[PDB]
Design a protein around this ligand. Structure first.
Ligand SMILES: */C=C/C(=O)N1CCN(c2c(C#N)c(=O)n(-c3c(C)ccnc3C(C)C)c3nc(-c4c(N)c(F)c(F)c(F)c4F)c(Cl)cc23)CC1
Ligand SMILES: Nc1nc2c(ncn2[C@@H]2O[C@H](COP(=O)(O)OP(=O)(O)O)[C@@H](O)[C@H]2O)c(=O)[nH]1
Ligand SMILES: [Cl-]
Ligand SMILES: [Mg+2]
Length: 167
């Protein structure tokens, strides 16, 4: 049988959670996808010779989902923690996303990948060095992405599957 992986995409409003997810699922860039929509998407992929069924939850942090947030997160096997390379606040928020994931999962060994999105844009305010130092402090990988060009997007999700395997 195919190995099934429940992945959860988190991070500040506007970092590109939806754009990243829709690239993997539908192979196109969506400009300004409805920021309020939270849904799960399924995709079959081959990673290192293993057929994987991915169930990806694209979080939107809306008030209507707030009561059930912990129940939705607890079934996640791995988390993509996304910031944008032109938004320092989204990078500062990463340690808070990790605080909440560690709380819900009651563990410091939750499979996780740090993702720096929008690497196509010129006006960078967070360097790869900063993100790699943060990832190293957590013992997790860092992957740079552009949801616009699709560069690195699959590497981010596939890296998270490899982290879930180690767990
Ligand atoms: C464009 C809309 C959008 O993408 N988002 C809306 C807001 N959102 C979000 C926010 C905000 N603003 C937020 O403050 N937090 C919380 C909460 C509610 C409580 C404590 N810390 C945070 C941040 C700073 C980590 C969000 N948390 C989560 C969330 C929660 N509650 C959780 F328990 C987890 F285990 C998570 F993995 C997790 F990520 C989410 Cl879904 C969304 C926000 C961002 C998205
Ligand atoms: N140039 C560029 N724009 C992006 C990228 N990813 C997302 N966007 C845009 O950034 C905004 C926020 O993206 P969205 O996917 O809605 O973020 P979410 O709130 O995290 O789901 C939208 O206007 C997207 O079109 C990227 O890699 N490059
Ligand atoms: Cl929430
Ligand atoms: Mg979204």
């Amino acid at each position: 049988s195919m190995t099934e992986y429940k992945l959860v995409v988190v991070g500040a409003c506007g970092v590109g959670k939806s754009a990243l997810t829709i690239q993997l699922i539908q192979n196109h860039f969506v400009d300004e996808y409805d920021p309020t929509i939270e849904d799960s998407y399924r995709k079959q992929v081959v990673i290192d010779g293993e057929t994987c069924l991915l169930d990806i939850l694209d979080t939107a942090g809306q008030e209507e989902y707030s009561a059930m947030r912990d129940q939705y997160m607890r079934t996640g096997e791995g988390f993509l923690c996304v910031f944008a390379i032109n938004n320092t606040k989204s990078f500062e928020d990463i340690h808070h996303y990790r605080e909440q994931i560690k709380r819900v999962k009651d563990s410091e060994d939750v499979p996780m990948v740090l993702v720096g999105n929008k690497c196509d844009l010129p006006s960078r305010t967070v360097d790869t060095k900063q993100a790699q130092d943060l990832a190293r402090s957590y013992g997790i990988p860092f992957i740079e992405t552009s949801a616009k060009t699709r560069q690195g997007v699959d590497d981010a999700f596939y890296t998270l599957v490899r982290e879930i395997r180690k767990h």
